Structures are given as C-alpha cells and as structure tokens.
C-alpha cells in the first residue's frame, strides 16, 4: 500500500491491515518514508484512534525493531515501569525486594532529561558502578545475582524511540494507544513475563486523570495479554514526590536507608504494593516482599548488584562515598499545613542546580538535590525549614524559586491515598 493511501485509510477512520501497518512503520525505520508522512499518520491515528488489535500490532512491530531479550531460561522474570511522573527512585527498592523474593529483575533503565530523573543517572552516583555491559554479562548477572540494571535502554525497540521523538515534536504524544504501545513495546522487547505498571494519577502535567489512567491501564494490560505477558497496573497519587530525597546520590542514600528499614513510610508502602502485585502475577506469595525487606535480604541483593556492576559495595555502609553538595535551608514564609509539593517544580529545581540535564548526552552533578523535610499533612511554622537544598553555587536562586512555588500550604491538609487501585 502507498504511504499516502495508508495515511488516508486512517484519516477516514478505517482499521489497518497488520501487513500494511508494519510495512509503513518499518519503512520509516529504514528512512524510506519521510517524517512528514509519518506525522500526518500519527495525527490521524491520534484523532481517529487505533483499536485493540491495531494497538497490539503496533506494539509488536516496534518491539521487534531492535534488540530483543530472551529470559525464558531464568526464574520468574519480572519488570516494573512507570507511566507519568518525573522518574522516582521506587525501582531502587522494588528491584532488590523482588530479586530477594525469588524473581529475576533484569531490566534496562533510562536517563533523565530536564525535570525528569533517571535510574541510570542515580546509580552512576555510586563510585565504580557501570550500566554498560555485554548481552552475555547481562544474562550472566541476571542468573547469578537476580538483579541487573543495564543502560543503553534505547537499544530496545528503536522504532519506538524514533516514533516517540516524532510524536514529541508533532503534538501526538498524549494518545492512549500510542502511549500504551510505546511503553509495552519496550517491555515486550525486554523479555519479562510479568510486568507491573505504576500509573500516576492527578490533575496536571505528567499526570493522568483517573479516567485517562484507567483507560491507559486497561489498554496496556490488554496488549500484554495479547502478547502472552502478565500485566498489572497500580494507580497511585502524586501530591508530592515519594520519600524525601530528589536528585541522584541523595536518592541512592534514601533507597539504601529504605532497604535497611529506616526509609520513609510512603516510599515503602508503594514499593511493597508494586512488588506484591509482581509476585501475584508470578503466582508467588505476596508476603515474600515484606519478608525480603524487613529481613535484610533485599539490602543484600542490592549490595551484590552494585558490586557485580563495578560499584563500591562500601557505599551501602558509608555515605561518604555518596557525597552531597553545600546545604542551604529553604524556610517557610507562611504558617499552615503542607497540602502539596509539586513534583514537577521540585524537578525543575534539581535541574537548575545541575542535577538534571538540559540536553541529551550531557553529564550531570550527582551531588546536588533537594531533601523535603515537610510533606503533605505536616504543620509548618514561619521560618521553619521546609527543605534542604544541596547546591554547587550554581542556579541556587532559580532553584529556590521553583521549590517555593512547588510548596502549597493551607489551614488544613487531607492527603489523598497513596495507592488508589490495581487493574
């Protein structure tokens, strides 16, 4: 089928033939089809929609466009992915918990950009740690350690990376079928059997309304099922970042404290909820999660994982190896109760401090960040420290501006449930 004919077919709201859909998209992959014809098709797909079958075919075509992992020889291979949000540290706790529960948590993580963080960036805060490894080393550590986090995530479903870049500059990102297929294409390529998705719910950017989140969750589950995978989505709120640390080295510190049984309650609650869903998908006793965490087995897995990838295992016991910058107190200029801490704005603050990157490929300062002392529900008096800002005397004024804007105080606080529902 001719490209113009393919675009027209969708423009008229017709359903594509999988044969034509694959030909069109792969033509784009090989640069045989111009970006302007693909963007026209994306807009038509966005507006006229893609049905469950079309959505599945799109997912599979993208999943097979690059590197594909086969974890069939490994025990209970699971994965976790976040939909929305600004890239939190929950995986640094969920991974260890699942690996210590008899599962194989071998995945590829990405890097942050602007206001969003990335697990790979956080882990590079650990001296010696490396996300680069060969296919053989990845499978070897998956088998021996049970927990592996590799970089080069983009090598998975390159067609998705290409299509996403186009969607991002043509206003065709926010479409449920396109979001669902994008996320699932990378999960199908990564090879895990059971996948748990954390979908952030709320009113604002990087958040989906309840209606949208439920539709997205239902769609990703259907795609997974259609491909023989087991999928479960957990919808959670985001009235503030999970935990108190936002940044890189500071977040690794917090994840370690959590694994030691000294972490923030909200982070622990969500991490266990996600781990428990993964276990249920694999037919494992969900009770194993809390057991692995409170017993220290999870911390043990995290330590072995760091060591296996070059990281200095000493960092687990001595935070001197995960240094932070200069500390500056952010003081409240009002009386009241914290009702919200805009995660987006906290991310903008971290970015201003140099803890984020403005351009892909640029390095970042792993020692800067924010530590939230007051979270929703907390009462704060004027002059009291809301947060601690770790800076390198760079963009501190802008950072403080964003952090102040992030905080929303009032007379009363009715913090919403952290975990809304599972789908």
- Residue 106, both tokens: 């071998």
Considering the rule CB under 8 A, would residue 218 count as an interface residue with a copy of itself?
no
Q: Which residues fall within 8 angstroms of residue 346, CB to CB, at 6 or more apart?
A: 86, 241, 246, 370, 372, 402, 403, 406
Which of 25, 42, 147, 176 lies at the binding interface for a copy of itself (CB under 8 A)?
42
Considering the rule CB under 5 A, would residue 416 count as an interface residue with Cl ion?
no
Q: Which stretch binds Cl ion (CB under 5 A): 141-149, 171-179, 205-213, 275-283?
A: 171-179
Which of 44, 201, 238, 368 lies at the binding interface for a copy of itself (CB under 8 A)?
44
Considering the rule CB under 8 A, would residue 35 count as an interface residue with a copy of itself?
yes
**319-356 b/e with 16+ CB inside 10 Å = b?**
eebbebbeebebebeeebbbbbbbbbbbbbbbbbbbbb
How do beta strands 78-83 and 194-201 pair?
parallel
Residues near Cl ion (CB under 5 A), total: 3
Considering the rule CB under 8 A, would residue 178 count as an interface residue with a copy of itself?
no
The site map against a copy of itself for 131-170 (x = CB under 8 A) is -----------------------------------x--xx
- Residue 287, both tokens: 């009770």
**Rounded Cα gap, residues 29 and 42, in angstroms:** 15
Distances (CA, A) of 328 to 319, 325, 396: 19, 10, 9
Q: Which stretch binds a copy of itself (CB under 8 A): 43-51, 153-161, 266-274, 297-305?
A: 43-51
How do beta strands 230-237 and 419-422 pair?
antiparallel
- Between 169 and 287, CB nearer to a copy of itself: 169
Reference 373, options 392, 363, 362, 388; nearest CA is 388
Considering the rule CB under 5 A, would residue 173 count as an interface residue with Cl ion?
yes
**Does the annotation mark 101 as catalytic?**
no
**Rounded Cα gap, residues 223 and 53, in angstroms:** 9
Considering the rule CB under 8 A, would residue 21 count as an interface residue with a copy of itself?
no
> Minimum Å distance from CB 261 to Cl ion?
42
Choose the catalytic residue: 76, 167, 303, 366.
Answer: 167
**Rounded Cα gap, residues 354 and 407, in angstroms:** 21
Residues at the site binding Cl ion, with contacts judged by CB under 5 A: 171, 173-174
Residues at the site binding a copy of itself, with contacts judged by CB under 8 A: 3-5, 7-8, 11, 34-40, 42-44, 46-48, 166, 169-172
């Amino acid at each position: 089928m001719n490209p113009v004919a393919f675009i027209r077919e969708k423009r008229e709201g017709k359903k594509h033939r999988r044969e034509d859909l694959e030909a069109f998209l792969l033509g784009y992959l090989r640069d045989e089809v111009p970006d302007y014809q693909v963007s026209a098709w994306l807009m038509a797909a966005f507006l006229r929609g893609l049905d469950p079958e079309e959505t599945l075919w799109l997912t599979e075509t993208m999943a097979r466009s690059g590197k594909v992992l086969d974890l069939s020889g490994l025990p209970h291979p699971v994965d976790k992915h976040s939909s929305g949000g600004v890239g939190d540290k929950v995986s640094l706790v969920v991974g260890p918990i699942l690996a210590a529960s008899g599962c194989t948590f071998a995945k590829m993580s990405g890097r942050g950009l602007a206001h969003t963080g990335g697990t790979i960036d956080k882990l590079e805060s650990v001296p010696g740690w490396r996300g680069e490894m060969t296919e053989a080393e990845f499978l070897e550590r998956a088998r021996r350690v049970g927990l592996v986090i590799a970089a080069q995530s983009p090598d998975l479903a390159p067609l998705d990376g290409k299509l996403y870049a186009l969607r991002d500059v043509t206003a065709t990102v926010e479409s449920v079928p396109l979001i669902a297929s994008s996320i699932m294409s990378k999960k199908l390529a990564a090879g895990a059997r059971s996948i748990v998705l954390d979908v952030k719910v709320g009113r604002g950017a990087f958040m989906k309304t309840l209606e949208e989140a439920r539709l997205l969750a239902k769609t990703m589950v259907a795609i997974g099922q259609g491909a023989g995978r087991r999928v479960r989505a957990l919808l959670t709120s985001m009235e503030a970042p999970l935990g108190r640390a936002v940044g890189n080295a500071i977040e690794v510190r917090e994840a370690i404290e959590a694994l030691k049984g000294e972490g923030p309650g909200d982070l622990l609650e969500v991490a266990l909820a996600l781990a428990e869903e993964a276990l249920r998908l694999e037919g494992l006793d969900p009770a194993l999660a809390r057991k692995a965490l409170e017993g220290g087995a999870a911390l043990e897995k995290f330590r072995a994982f760091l060591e296996a990838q070059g990281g200095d295992p000493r960092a687990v016991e001595d935070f001197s190896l995960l240094p932070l910058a200069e500390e500056h107190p952010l003081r409240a200029e009002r009386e009241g109760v914290v009702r919200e801490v805009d995660a987006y704005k906290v991310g903008l603050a971290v970015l201003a401090l140099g803890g984020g990157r403005k351009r892909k490929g640029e390095p970042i300062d792993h020692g800067v960040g924010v530590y939230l002392l007051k979270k929703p529900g907390d009462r704060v008096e004027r002059g009291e420290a809301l947060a601690l800002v770790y800076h390198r005397r760079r963009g501190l004024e802008e950072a403080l501006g964003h952090l102040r804007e992030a905080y929303a105080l009032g007379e009363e606080a009715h913090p919403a449930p952290l975990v809304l529902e599972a789908i």
